[PDB]
Amino acid sequence: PEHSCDVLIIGSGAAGLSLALRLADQHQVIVLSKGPVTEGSTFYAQGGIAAVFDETDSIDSHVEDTLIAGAGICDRHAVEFVASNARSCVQWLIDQGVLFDTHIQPNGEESYHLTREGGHSHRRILHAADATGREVETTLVSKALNHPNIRVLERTNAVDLIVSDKIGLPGTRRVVGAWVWNRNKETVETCHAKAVVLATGGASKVYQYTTNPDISSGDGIAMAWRAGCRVANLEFNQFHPTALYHPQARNFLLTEALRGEGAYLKRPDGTRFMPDFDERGELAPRDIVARAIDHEMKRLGADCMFLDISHKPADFIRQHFPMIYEKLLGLGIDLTQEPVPIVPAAHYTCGGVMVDDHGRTDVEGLYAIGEVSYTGLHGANLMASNSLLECLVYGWSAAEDITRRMPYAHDISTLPPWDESRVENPDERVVIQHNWHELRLFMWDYVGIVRTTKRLERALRRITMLQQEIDEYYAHFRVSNNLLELRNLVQVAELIVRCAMMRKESRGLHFTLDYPELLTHSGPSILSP
Numbered sequence: 001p002e003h004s005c006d007v008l009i010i011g012s013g014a015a016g017l018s019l020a021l022r023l024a025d026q027h028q029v030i031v032l033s034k035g036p037v038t039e040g041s042t043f044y045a046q047g048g049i050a051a052v053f054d055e056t057d058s059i060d061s062h063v064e065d066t067l068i069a070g071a072g073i074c075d076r077h078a079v080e081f082v083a084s085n086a087r088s089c090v091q092w093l094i095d096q097g098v099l100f101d102t103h104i105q106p107n108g109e110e111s112y113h114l115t116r117e118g119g120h121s122h123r124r125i126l127h128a129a130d131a132t133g134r135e136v137e138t139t140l141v142s143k144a145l146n147h148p149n150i151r152v153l154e155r156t157n158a159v160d161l162i163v164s165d166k167i168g169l170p171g172t173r174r175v176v177g178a179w180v181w182n183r184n185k186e187t188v189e190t191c192h193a194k195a196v197v198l199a200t201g202g203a204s205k206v207y208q209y210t211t212n213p214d215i216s217s218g219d220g221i222a223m224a225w226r227a228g229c230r231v232a233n234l235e236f237n238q239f240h241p242t243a244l245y246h247p248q249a250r251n252f253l254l255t256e257a258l259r260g261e262g263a264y265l266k267r268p269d270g271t272r273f274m275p276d277f278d279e280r281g282e283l284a285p286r287d288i289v290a291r292a293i294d295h296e297m298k299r300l301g302a303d304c305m306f307l308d309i310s311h312k313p314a315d316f317i318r319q320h321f322p323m324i325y326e327k328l329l330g331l332g333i334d335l336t337q338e339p340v341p342i343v344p345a346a347h348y349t350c351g352g353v354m355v356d357d358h359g360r361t362d363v364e365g366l367y368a369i370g371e372v373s374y375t376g377l378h379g380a381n382l383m384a385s386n387s388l389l390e391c392l393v394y395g396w397s398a399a400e401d402i403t404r405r406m407p408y409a410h411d412i413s414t415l416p417p418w419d420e421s422r423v424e425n426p427d428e429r430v431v432i433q434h435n436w437h438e439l440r441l442f443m444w445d446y447v448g449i450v451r452t453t454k455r456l457e458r459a460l461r462r463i464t465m466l467q468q469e470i471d472e473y474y475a476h477f478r479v480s481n482n483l484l485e486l487r488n489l490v491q492v493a494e495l496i497v498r499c500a501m502m503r504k505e506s507r508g509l510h511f512t513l514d515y516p517e518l519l520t521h522s523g524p525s526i527l528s529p
Protein backbone atom coordinates (compact mmCIF):
# COMPACT_ATOMS: atom_id res chain seq x y z
CA PRO A 1 0.00 0.00 0.00
CA GLU A 2 1.67 3.10 1.30
CA HIS A 3 4.59 0.79 2.09
CA SER A 4 4.76 -2.93 2.64
CA CYS A 5 7.59 -5.35 3.21
CA ASP A 6 8.53 -8.45 5.05
CA VAL A 7 11.14 -6.91 7.31
CA LEU A 8 11.55 -3.20 8.04
CA ILE A 9 14.94 -2.10 9.13
CA ILE A 10 15.28 1.31 10.69
CA GLY A 11 18.88 2.36 10.07
CA SER A 12 21.50 1.58 7.50
CA GLY A 13 24.89 1.30 9.17
CA ALA A 14 26.76 -1.89 9.91
CA ALA A 15 23.87 -3.31 11.86
CA GLY A 16 21.10 -2.73 9.41
CA LEU A 17 22.72 -3.15 6.09
CA SER A 18 24.52 -6.21 7.19
CA LEU A 19 21.20 -7.56 8.52
CA ALA A 20 19.69 -6.60 5.16
CA LEU A 21 21.92 -8.66 3.00
CA ARG A 22 21.61 -11.76 5.17
CA LEU A 23 17.83 -11.57 4.79
CA ALA A 24 17.65 -10.38 1.20
CA ASP A 25 17.86 -13.54 -0.97
CA GLN A 26 14.55 -14.65 0.67
CA HIS A 27 12.71 -11.65 2.05
CA GLN A 28 11.43 -8.28 0.94
CA VAL A 29 13.24 -5.56 2.82
CA ILE A 30 12.98 -1.87 3.27
CA VAL A 31 16.02 -0.15 4.95
CA LEU A 32 15.43 3.36 6.21
CA SER A 33 17.95 6.11 6.70
CA LYS A 34 17.18 9.46 8.39
CA GLY A 35 19.72 11.20 6.18
CA PRO A 36 21.63 9.94 3.16
CA VAL A 37 22.15 6.19 3.32
CA THR A 38 25.72 6.48 4.51
CA GLU A 39 25.64 9.05 7.27
CA GLY A 40 25.70 7.21 10.52
CA SER A 41 28.49 6.48 12.89
CA THR A 42 29.62 3.50 10.90
CA PHE A 43 30.95 5.61 8.13
CA TYR A 44 33.17 7.42 10.51
CA ALA A 45 34.73 4.45 12.09
CA GLN A 46 38.50 4.51 12.20
CA GLY A 47 40.33 1.90 14.31
CA GLY A 48 38.94 -1.38 13.03
CA ILE A 49 36.88 -4.39 14.07
CA ALA A 50 37.91 -6.82 16.78
CA ALA A 51 38.14 -10.49 16.17
CA VAL A 52 40.84 -13.03 16.90
CA PHE A 53 42.95 -14.02 13.90
CA ASP A 54 46.45 -14.65 15.12
CA GLU A 55 47.48 -18.16 16.16
CA THR A 56 48.89 -16.46 19.28
CA ASP A 57 45.65 -14.79 20.39
CA SER A 58 42.74 -16.76 21.72
CA ILE A 59 38.98 -16.33 22.09
CA ASP A 60 39.49 -16.85 25.76
CA SER A 61 41.81 -13.90 25.77
CA HIS A 62 39.32 -11.75 23.96
CA VAL A 63 36.57 -12.66 26.45
CA GLU A 64 38.72 -11.79 29.53
CA ASP A 65 39.73 -8.57 28.13
CA THR A 66 36.17 -7.65 27.66
CA LEU A 67 35.09 -8.87 30.98
CA ILE A 68 37.86 -6.69 32.47
CA ALA A 69 37.32 -3.59 30.45
CA GLY A 70 33.66 -3.83 31.32
CA ALA A 71 34.30 -3.46 35.01
CA GLY A 72 32.61 -6.48 36.34
CA ILE A 73 29.11 -6.60 34.99
CA CYS A 74 29.29 -7.70 31.45
CA ASP A 75 27.20 -10.62 30.70
CA ARG A 76 29.49 -13.61 30.04
CA HIS A 77 27.07 -15.63 27.81
CA ALA A 78 26.82 -12.60 25.57
CA VAL A 79 30.45 -11.74 25.55
CA GLU A 80 31.57 -15.35 24.87
CA PHE A 81 28.76 -15.96 22.60
CA VAL A 82 29.74 -12.94 20.70
CA ALA A 83 33.57 -13.30 21.33
CA SER A 84 33.27 -16.77 19.63
CA ASN A 85 31.69 -15.58 16.31
CA ALA A 86 33.45 -12.70 14.34
CA ARG A 87 35.82 -13.26 11.76
CA SER A 88 33.15 -15.58 10.55
CA CYS A 89 30.92 -12.58 10.76
CA VAL A 90 34.16 -10.83 10.05
CA GLN A 91 34.88 -13.25 7.29
CA TRP A 92 31.37 -12.72 6.05
CA LEU A 93 32.06 -9.05 5.66
CA ILE A 94 35.18 -9.91 3.76
CA ASP A 95 33.28 -12.31 1.59
CA GLN A 96 31.09 -9.35 0.82
CA GLY A 97 33.82 -7.30 -0.57
CA VAL A 98 35.57 -5.66 2.34
CA LEU A 99 39.24 -4.93 2.08
CA PHE A 100 41.06 -4.86 5.34
CA ASP A 101 44.71 -4.04 5.38
CA THR A 102 46.88 -6.84 4.06
CA HIS A 103 50.20 -7.34 5.81
CA ILE A 104 53.05 -8.83 3.60
CA GLN A 105 55.27 -10.25 6.23
CA PRO A 106 54.71 -12.58 9.18
CA ASN A 107 58.29 -13.73 8.82
CA GLY A 108 57.20 -16.06 5.93
CA GLU A 109 53.85 -15.11 4.33
CA GLU A 110 50.81 -12.76 3.80
CA SER A 111 48.40 -11.74 6.61
CA TYR A 112 45.82 -9.15 7.72
CA HIS A 113 47.61 -6.45 9.40
CA LEU A 114 46.34 -6.05 12.92
CA THR A 115 46.36 -3.23 15.50
CA ARG A 116 45.50 -3.16 19.14
CA GLU A 117 43.82 -0.55 21.41
CA GLY A 118 43.28 -0.18 25.13
CA GLY A 119 42.44 -3.25 27.16
CA HIS A 120 43.49 -5.71 24.46
CA SER A 121 46.31 -8.15 25.30
CA HIS A 122 47.27 -9.52 21.89
CA ARG A 123 46.88 -8.32 18.33
CA ARG A 124 43.44 -8.41 16.89
CA ILE A 125 41.84 -5.51 15.13
CA LEU A 126 41.42 -5.79 11.39
CA HIS A 127 41.32 -2.35 9.79
CA ALA A 128 41.52 -0.17 6.65
CA ALA A 129 44.26 2.23 7.31
CA ASP A 130 42.75 4.55 9.92
CA ALA A 131 39.30 4.76 8.21
CA THR A 132 37.86 1.28 8.46
CA GLY A 133 34.38 2.62 8.63
CA ARG A 134 34.50 4.08 5.15
CA GLU A 135 35.48 0.83 3.68
CA VAL A 136 32.84 -0.91 5.55
CA GLU A 137 29.91 1.33 5.03
CA THR A 138 30.63 2.02 1.41
CA THR A 139 30.66 -1.71 0.56
CA LEU A 140 27.61 -2.75 2.46
CA VAL A 141 25.79 0.09 0.91
CA SER A 142 26.89 -0.76 -2.51
CA LYS A 143 25.70 -4.31 -2.28
CA ALA A 144 22.41 -3.30 -0.71
CA LEU A 145 21.63 -0.96 -3.57
CA ASN A 146 22.30 -3.71 -6.17
CA HIS A 147 19.84 -6.08 -4.60
CA PRO A 148 16.48 -6.75 -6.10
CA ASN A 149 14.79 -7.49 -2.79
CA ILE A 150 16.20 -4.55 -0.80
CA ARG A 151 14.60 -1.15 -1.06
CA VAL A 152 16.59 1.76 0.44
CA LEU A 153 14.71 4.92 1.38
CA GLU A 154 17.07 7.75 2.15
CA ARG A 155 16.09 10.90 4.07
CA THR A 156 13.23 9.20 5.72
CA ASN A 157 12.80 9.63 9.42
CA ALA A 158 10.77 7.18 11.56
CA VAL A 159 8.51 8.82 14.02
CA ASP A 160 7.17 5.97 15.98
CA LEU A 161 6.39 2.27 15.90
CA ILE A 162 2.83 1.07 15.38
CA VAL A 163 1.90 -1.27 18.12
CA SER A 164 -1.11 -3.43 17.66
CA ASP A 165 -2.70 -2.81 20.96
CA LYS A 166 -2.40 0.93 20.44
CA ILE A 167 -4.38 1.02 17.29
CA GLY A 168 -7.20 -1.25 18.41
CA LEU A 169 -5.80 -4.32 16.66
CA PRO A 170 -6.79 -7.29 18.85
CA GLY A 171 -4.17 -9.75 20.08
CA THR A 172 -1.07 -9.44 22.26
CA ARG A 173 1.06 -6.36 21.98
CA ARG A 174 3.04 -6.70 18.73
CA VAL A 175 4.73 -4.27 16.35
CA VAL A 176 3.20 -4.16 12.95
CA GLY A 177 4.99 -1.28 11.23
CA ALA A 178 6.00 2.34 11.74
CA TRP A 179 5.07 5.82 10.66
CA VAL A 180 7.75 7.61 8.76
CA TRP A 181 8.26 11.33 8.04
CA ASN A 182 9.12 11.35 4.34
CA ARG A 183 11.52 14.30 4.44
CA ASN A 184 11.50 15.12 0.68
CA LYS A 185 7.69 15.24 0.45
CA GLU A 186 7.04 16.46 3.95
CA THR A 187 4.28 13.84 4.84
CA VAL A 188 4.29 11.05 7.38
CA GLU A 189 3.83 7.89 5.40
CA THR A 190 2.55 4.60 6.74
CA CYS A 191 4.80 1.56 6.45
CA HIS A 192 3.67 -2.05 7.09
CA ALA A 193 5.67 -5.00 7.97
CA LYS A 194 5.87 -8.39 9.56
CA ALA A 195 9.01 -7.57 11.50
CA VAL A 196 10.60 -4.28 12.44
CA VAL A 197 14.26 -3.94 13.44
CA LEU A 198 15.60 -0.84 15.21
CA ALA A 199 19.16 -0.29 14.10
CA THR A 200 19.34 3.44 14.69
CA GLY A 201 22.73 3.97 16.35
CA GLY A 202 23.37 5.64 19.63
CA ALA A 203 22.49 8.74 21.55
CA SER A 204 25.77 10.44 22.21
CA LYS A 205 24.42 13.63 20.83
CA VAL A 206 22.44 14.35 23.95
CA TYR A 207 25.75 15.76 25.28
CA GLN A 208 27.18 19.07 24.25
CA TYR A 209 30.50 17.54 23.03
CA THR A 210 30.73 14.37 20.96
CA THR A 211 32.60 12.47 18.19
CA ASN A 212 29.37 11.47 16.46
CA PRO A 213 27.63 12.71 13.36
CA ASP A 214 24.52 14.82 14.01
CA ILE A 215 22.22 11.80 13.64
CA SER A 216 23.05 10.12 16.79
CA SER A 217 20.04 11.42 18.53
CA GLY A 218 18.94 8.08 19.97
CA ASP A 219 15.63 7.92 18.18
CA GLY A 220 15.65 4.14 18.24
CA ILE A 221 15.78 3.94 22.03
CA ALA A 222 13.08 6.52 22.53
CA MET A 223 10.90 4.75 19.99
CA ALA A 224 11.32 1.48 21.73
CA TRP A 225 10.58 2.89 25.11
CA ARG A 226 7.50 4.54 23.88
CA ALA A 227 6.48 1.18 22.52
CA GLY A 228 6.93 -0.63 25.81
CA CYS A 229 10.52 -1.93 25.71
CA ARG A 230 12.53 -2.20 29.01
CA VAL A 231 15.95 -0.44 28.61
CA ALA A 232 19.21 -0.61 30.49
CA ASN A 233 22.57 0.74 31.53
CA LEU A 234 21.99 4.10 30.10
CA GLU A 235 24.30 5.70 32.61
CA PHE A 236 27.18 4.06 30.93
CA ASN A 237 27.99 6.52 28.17
CA GLN A 238 31.52 6.58 26.96
CA PHE A 239 33.51 9.65 26.55
CA HIS A 240 36.25 8.80 24.12
CA PRO A 241 39.35 10.21 25.68
CA THR A 242 40.95 11.61 22.55
CA ALA A 243 38.92 14.01 20.52
CA LEU A 244 40.54 16.95 18.89
CA TYR A 245 40.57 20.34 20.50
CA HIS A 246 40.45 22.71 17.65
CA PRO A 247 37.91 25.42 16.75
CA GLN A 248 37.57 23.92 13.29
CA ALA A 249 37.32 20.17 14.26
CA ARG A 250 33.54 20.35 14.28
CA ASN A 251 33.84 17.02 16.16
CA PHE A 252 37.02 14.95 15.66
CA LEU A 253 38.34 11.70 16.99
CA LEU A 254 41.90 10.48 16.75
CA THR A 255 41.55 6.77 17.03
CA GLU A 256 42.73 4.81 20.00
CA ALA A 257 44.75 2.98 17.41
CA LEU A 258 47.19 5.81 17.63
CA ARG A 259 47.96 4.79 21.16
CA GLY A 260 47.86 1.24 20.03
CA GLU A 261 50.82 1.90 17.79
CA GLY A 262 52.82 3.99 20.24
CA ALA A 263 51.29 7.43 20.54
CA TYR A 264 51.75 9.12 23.90
CA LEU A 265 49.41 11.16 25.99
CA LYS A 266 51.07 14.26 27.33
CA ARG A 267 50.40 17.17 29.67
CA PRO A 268 50.49 20.60 28.14
CA ASP A 269 54.09 20.66 29.55
CA GLY A 270 55.43 17.52 27.80
CA THR A 271 55.11 15.07 30.71
CA ARG A 272 53.20 11.82 30.36
CA PHE A 273 50.49 11.79 32.97
CA MET A 274 48.88 8.30 32.67
CA PRO A 275 51.43 6.71 35.01
CA ASP A 276 50.01 8.77 37.77
CA PHE A 277 46.83 6.97 37.28
CA ASP A 278 47.09 3.52 35.89
CA GLU A 279 50.02 1.24 35.36
CA ARG A 280 48.39 0.36 32.01
CA GLY A 281 49.17 3.84 30.69
CA GLU A 282 48.23 5.10 27.31
CA LEU A 283 46.41 1.83 26.71
CA ALA A 284 44.18 1.56 29.78
CA PRO A 285 40.43 1.43 29.32
CA ARG A 286 38.58 4.54 28.37
CA ASP A 287 36.48 5.27 31.39
CA ILE A 288 39.83 5.52 33.20
CA VAL A 289 41.92 7.40 30.72
CA ALA A 290 39.06 9.77 30.11
CA ARG A 291 38.70 10.40 33.76
CA ALA A 292 42.41 11.02 33.95
CA ILE A 293 42.43 13.59 31.26
CA ASP A 294 39.46 15.26 32.73
CA HIS A 295 41.29 15.41 36.08
CA GLU A 296 44.45 16.95 34.76
CA MET A 297 42.37 19.50 32.92
CA LYS A 298 40.56 20.50 36.00
CA ARG A 299 43.72 20.43 38.07
CA LEU A 300 46.01 22.54 35.97
CA GLY A 301 43.17 24.61 34.54
CA ALA A 302 44.15 23.49 31.03
CA ASP A 303 42.04 23.64 27.97
CA CYS A 304 43.50 20.32 26.89
CA MET A 305 45.98 17.54 26.83
CA PHE A 306 48.00 16.15 24.00
CA LEU A 307 48.46 13.08 21.83
CA ASP A 308 51.87 12.60 20.21
CA ILE A 309 53.27 9.77 17.98
CA SER A 310 56.21 11.93 16.88
CA HIS A 311 58.87 9.81 18.44
CA LYS A 312 57.95 7.74 15.47
CA PRO A 313 59.06 7.37 11.92
CA ALA A 314 57.20 9.82 9.75
CA ASP A 315 56.81 6.95 7.22
CA PHE A 316 55.03 4.55 9.52
CA ILE A 317 52.85 7.31 10.62
CA ARG A 318 51.75 8.40 7.18
CA GLN A 319 51.13 4.88 5.94
CA HIS A 320 49.11 3.88 9.01
CA PHE A 321 47.25 7.15 9.52
CA PRO A 322 46.71 8.49 6.06
CA MET A 323 43.33 10.07 6.73
CA ILE A 324 44.16 11.59 10.05
CA TYR A 325 47.42 13.03 8.70
CA GLU A 326 45.76 14.59 5.65
CA LYS A 327 43.05 16.11 7.81
CA LEU A 328 45.30 17.53 10.54
CA LEU A 329 47.55 18.97 7.89
CA GLY A 330 44.67 20.97 6.50
CA LEU A 331 44.28 22.58 9.88
CA GLY A 332 48.01 23.06 9.99
CA ILE A 333 49.00 20.30 12.41
CA ASP A 334 51.56 17.64 11.47
CA LEU A 335 50.81 14.34 13.15
CA THR A 336 54.33 13.64 11.98
CA GLN A 337 55.94 16.40 14.00
CA GLU A 338 53.93 17.75 16.98
CA PRO A 339 51.66 16.84 19.92
CA VAL A 340 47.93 17.29 18.91
CA PRO A 341 45.49 18.94 21.35
CA ILE A 342 42.76 16.57 22.64
CA VAL A 343 39.71 16.53 24.95
CA PRO A 344 37.26 13.83 25.98
CA ALA A 345 33.91 13.77 24.17
CA ALA A 346 30.75 11.78 24.16
CA HIS A 347 31.27 8.81 21.87
CA TYR A 348 29.24 5.55 22.42
CA THR A 349 26.06 4.41 24.22
CA CYS A 350 26.84 1.23 26.06
CA GLY A 351 23.25 0.79 27.14
CA GLY A 352 20.04 0.90 25.13
CA VAL A 353 17.03 -1.39 24.45
CA MET A 354 17.35 -4.79 26.13
CA VAL A 355 17.36 -7.62 23.63
CA ASP A 356 18.29 -11.32 23.81
CA ASP A 357 20.68 -13.43 21.65
CA HIS A 358 18.73 -12.87 18.46
CA GLY A 359 17.95 -9.22 18.97
CA ARG A 360 14.49 -9.81 20.30
CA THR A 361 13.14 -6.96 22.44
CA ASP A 362 10.43 -7.10 24.98
CA VAL A 363 7.85 -6.49 22.22
CA GLU A 364 6.78 -9.11 19.73
CA GLY A 365 7.80 -8.47 16.20
CA LEU A 366 10.35 -5.84 17.33
CA TYR A 367 14.15 -6.35 17.20
CA ALA A 368 17.09 -4.11 18.08
CA ILE A 369 20.71 -4.63 17.13
CA GLY A 370 23.76 -2.37 17.07
CA GLU A 371 24.46 0.48 19.37
CA VAL A 372 20.86 1.23 20.03
CA SER A 373 20.63 -2.06 21.95
CA TYR A 374 21.77 -3.50 25.24
CA THR A 375 22.90 -7.20 25.11
CA GLY A 376 25.19 -7.41 28.08
CA LEU A 377 28.36 -7.48 26.03
CA HIS A 378 29.86 -4.16 27.26
CA GLY A 379 28.82 -4.10 30.80
CA ALA A 380 29.94 -0.80 32.19
CA ASN A 381 32.36 0.13 29.55
CA LEU A 382 33.08 -0.78 26.01
CA MET A 383 36.36 -2.15 24.79
CA ALA A 384 37.58 -0.62 21.58
CA SER A 385 36.42 -2.45 18.42
CA ASN A 386 33.84 -4.51 20.23
CA SER A 387 31.23 -2.05 18.96
CA LEU A 388 31.31 -2.62 15.23
CA LEU A 389 31.77 -6.27 16.17
CA GLU A 390 28.37 -6.33 17.99
CA CYS A 391 26.61 -5.05 14.94
CA LEU A 392 27.75 -7.90 12.83
CA VAL A 393 27.08 -10.74 15.24
CA TYR A 394 23.66 -9.49 16.02
CA GLY A 395 22.95 -8.85 12.42
CA TRP A 396 23.82 -12.54 12.05
CA SER A 397 21.79 -13.90 14.90
CA ALA A 398 18.95 -11.67 14.01
CA ALA A 399 18.89 -12.97 10.45
CA GLU A 400 18.73 -16.57 11.65
CA ASP A 401 15.81 -16.08 14.09
CA ILE A 402 13.91 -14.07 11.56
CA THR A 403 14.23 -16.45 8.59
CA ARG A 404 12.75 -19.12 10.93
CA ARG A 405 9.82 -17.01 11.96
CA MET A 406 8.87 -15.34 8.71
CA PRO A 407 6.96 -18.23 7.19
CA TYR A 408 4.48 -18.38 10.05
CA ALA A 409 3.80 -14.65 10.04
CA HIS A 410 0.42 -12.93 10.26
CA ASP A 411 -0.77 -11.29 7.10
CA ILE A 412 0.06 -7.73 6.34
CA SER A 413 -3.15 -5.99 7.54
CA THR A 414 -4.11 -2.28 6.94
CA LEU A 415 -3.15 0.60 9.31
CA PRO A 416 -4.31 3.94 10.54
CA PRO A 417 -2.54 6.92 9.01
CA TRP A 418 -0.62 9.46 11.03
CA ASP A 419 -2.79 12.41 12.08
CA GLU A 420 -0.41 15.02 10.44
CA SER A 421 -0.62 17.86 12.91
CA ARG A 422 -0.11 21.18 11.20
CA VAL A 423 0.31 24.33 13.28
CA GLU A 424 3.05 26.80 12.48
CA ASN A 425 5.03 29.36 14.52
CA PRO A 426 8.26 30.87 13.32
CA ASP A 427 9.19 32.09 16.81
CA GLU A 428 8.36 29.10 18.82
CA ARG A 429 10.40 27.15 16.23
CA VAL A 430 13.37 29.17 17.18
CA VAL A 431 12.85 28.22 20.78
CA ILE A 432 12.86 24.49 19.80
CA GLN A 433 16.33 25.26 18.85
CA HIS A 434 17.16 26.91 22.22
CA ASN A 435 15.98 23.84 24.05
CA TRP A 436 18.24 21.57 22.07
CA HIS A 437 21.20 23.68 23.24
CA GLU A 438 19.86 23.80 26.67
CA LEU A 439 19.61 20.07 26.96
CA ARG A 440 23.03 19.33 25.64
CA LEU A 441 24.69 21.74 27.92
CA PHE A 442 23.33 20.65 31.25
CA MET A 443 23.62 17.00 30.36
CA TRP A 444 27.29 17.71 30.00
CA ASP A 445 27.35 19.29 33.36
CA TYR A 446 24.97 17.16 35.24
CA VAL A 447 25.42 13.76 33.79
CA GLY A 448 29.00 14.03 32.61
CA ILE A 449 32.37 12.49 33.43
CA VAL A 450 32.26 13.19 37.17
CA ARG A 451 28.93 13.00 38.82
CA THR A 452 26.99 13.64 42.06
CA THR A 453 23.56 12.80 43.35
CA LYS A 454 22.63 16.39 43.50
CA ARG A 455 23.88 17.17 40.11
CA LEU A 456 21.76 14.33 38.86
CA GLU A 457 18.67 15.90 40.47
CA ARG A 458 19.41 19.02 38.70
CA ALA A 459 19.41 17.11 35.45
CA LEU A 460 16.21 15.31 36.16
CA ARG A 461 14.59 18.49 37.13
CA ARG A 462 15.43 20.35 33.99
CA ILE A 463 14.50 17.23 31.98
CA THR A 464 10.91 17.24 33.41
CA MET A 465 10.61 20.99 32.73
CA LEU A 466 11.59 20.30 29.17
CA GLN A 467 9.06 17.43 28.83
CA GLN A 468 6.18 19.31 30.54
CA GLU A 469 7.27 22.17 28.60
CA ILE A 470 7.35 20.27 25.29
CA ASP A 471 3.90 18.81 25.56
CA GLU A 472 2.25 22.10 26.18
CA TYR A 473 3.91 24.23 23.59
CA TYR A 474 4.64 21.52 21.01
CA ALA A 475 2.10 18.53 21.02
CA HIS A 476 0.35 20.14 17.93
CA PHE A 477 3.43 21.20 15.94
CA ARG A 478 3.83 20.26 12.32
CA VAL A 479 6.55 17.63 12.47
CA SER A 480 10.03 18.44 11.37
CA ASN A 481 13.57 17.22 12.00
CA ASN A 482 14.50 19.67 14.73
CA LEU A 483 11.40 18.87 16.59
CA LEU A 484 11.52 15.16 16.26
CA GLU A 485 15.13 15.09 17.40
CA LEU A 486 14.37 17.20 20.48
CA ARG A 487 11.47 15.14 21.60
CA ASN A 488 13.66 12.05 21.34
CA LEU A 489 16.78 13.52 22.98
CA VAL A 490 14.69 14.67 25.88
CA GLN A 491 13.00 11.26 26.10
CA VAL A 492 16.42 9.58 26.29
CA ALA A 493 18.02 12.08 28.65
CA GLU A 494 15.30 11.07 31.01
CA LEU A 495 16.17 7.44 30.97
CA ILE A 496 19.90 8.18 31.11
CA VAL A 497 19.36 10.18 34.23
CA ARG A 498 16.94 7.75 35.86
CA CYS A 499 19.41 4.99 35.29
CA ALA A 500 22.27 7.08 36.63
CA MET A 501 20.32 7.86 39.77
CA MET A 502 19.69 4.13 40.57
CA ARG A 503 23.32 3.08 40.73
CA LYS A 504 24.49 3.56 44.29
CA GLU A 505 28.08 2.94 43.27
CA SER A 506 30.94 4.01 41.03
CA ARG A 507 31.68 1.45 38.26
CA GLY A 508 33.23 1.74 34.82
CA LEU A 509 31.91 4.77 33.10
CA HIS A 510 29.71 5.79 36.03
CA PHE A 511 31.70 7.67 38.52
CA THR A 512 29.90 9.49 41.36
CA LEU A 513 31.44 11.47 44.23
CA ASP A 514 28.71 10.19 46.43
CA TYR A 515 29.49 6.49 46.03
CA PRO A 516 33.14 5.99 45.30
CA GLU A 517 32.93 2.36 46.21
CA LEU A 518 32.01 -0.85 44.33
CA LEU A 519 28.88 -2.63 45.60
CA THR A 520 29.68 -6.36 46.07
CA HIS A 521 26.83 -7.69 43.88
CA SER A 522 25.74 -5.52 40.97
CA GLY A 523 24.20 -5.74 37.60
CA PRO A 524 22.68 -3.73 34.87
CA SER A 525 20.31 -0.84 35.74
CA ILE A 526 16.87 -1.55 34.22
CA LEU A 527 13.95 0.65 33.58
CA SER A 528 10.72 -0.55 32.22
CA PRO A 529 7.89 1.56 30.97
Ligand SMILES: Cc1cc2nc3c(=O)[nH]c(=O)nc-3n(C[C@H](O)[C@H](O)[C@H](O)COP(=O)(O)OP(=O)(O)OC[C@H]3O[C@@H](n4cnc5c(N)ncnc54)[C@H](O)[C@@H]3O)c2cc1C
Pocket residue numbers: 010011012013014015016032033034035037039040041042043044045046047048049050132133156157158159199200201202211212213215219220253347348369370371372384385386387388389391
Ligand atom coordinates in the same frame (compact mmCIF):
# COMPACT_ATOMS: atom_id res chain seq x y z
C1 LIG B 1 34.16 8.56 14.81
C2 LIG B 1 33.95 7.14 15.27
C3 LIG B 1 34.88 6.15 15.13
C4 LIG B 1 34.53 4.87 15.57
N1 LIG B 1 35.37 3.84 15.25
C5 LIG B 1 34.98 2.56 15.59
C6 LIG B 1 35.78 1.48 15.33
O1 LIG B 1 36.86 1.58 14.75
N2 LIG B 1 35.35 0.24 15.72
C7 LIG B 1 34.16 0.02 16.31
O2 LIG B 1 33.84 -1.14 16.61
N3 LIG B 1 33.36 1.09 16.57
C8 LIG B 1 33.77 2.32 16.21
N4 LIG B 1 32.98 3.30 16.55
C9 LIG B 1 31.73 2.81 17.23
C10 LIG B 1 30.86 2.19 16.14
O3 LIG B 1 31.13 3.05 15.09
C11 LIG B 1 29.36 2.36 16.33
O4 LIG B 1 28.97 1.81 17.55
C12 LIG B 1 28.58 1.64 15.26
O5 LIG B 1 29.09 2.09 14.03
C13 LIG B 1 27.10 2.00 15.34
O6 LIG B 1 26.50 1.54 14.16
P1 LIG B 1 24.94 1.24 14.02
O7 LIG B 1 24.69 0.36 12.88
O8 LIG B 1 24.23 0.70 15.26
O9 LIG B 1 24.32 2.69 13.76
P2 LIG B 1 24.95 3.86 12.91
O10 LIG B 1 26.13 3.47 11.99
O11 LIG B 1 25.41 5.03 13.67
O12 LIG B 1 23.68 4.27 12.03
C14 LIG B 1 22.41 4.56 12.56
C15 LIG B 1 21.47 4.54 11.38
O13 LIG B 1 20.13 4.62 11.83
C16 LIG B 1 19.49 5.64 11.05
N5 LIG B 1 18.49 6.29 11.86
C17 LIG B 1 18.72 6.85 13.07
N6 LIG B 1 17.58 7.35 13.55
C18 LIG B 1 16.62 7.12 12.65
C19 LIG B 1 15.28 7.41 12.66
N7 LIG B 1 14.75 8.26 13.54
N8 LIG B 1 14.53 7.03 11.59
C20 LIG B 1 15.14 6.38 10.53
N9 LIG B 1 16.49 6.08 10.50
C21 LIG B 1 17.20 6.44 11.58
C22 LIG B 1 20.61 6.62 10.93
O14 LIG B 1 20.29 7.58 9.98
C23 LIG B 1 21.69 5.72 10.47
O15 LIG B 1 21.27 5.37 9.18
C24 LIG B 1 33.28 4.57 16.11
C25 LIG B 1 32.36 5.57 16.23
C26 LIG B 1 32.70 6.84 15.82
C27 LIG B 1 31.70 7.97 15.89
Ligand SMILES: [Cl-]
Pocket residue numbers: 046047254255256257384
Ligand atom coordinates in the same frame (compact mmCIF):
# COMPACT_ATOMS: atom_id res chain seq x y z
CL1 LIG C 1 38.67 4.57 17.75
Ligand code: NA
Pocket residue numbers: 349350351352370371372373374
Ligand atom coordinates in the same frame (compact mmCIF):
# COMPACT_ATOMS: atom_id res chain seq x y z
NA1 NA D 1 24.38 -0.19 22.90
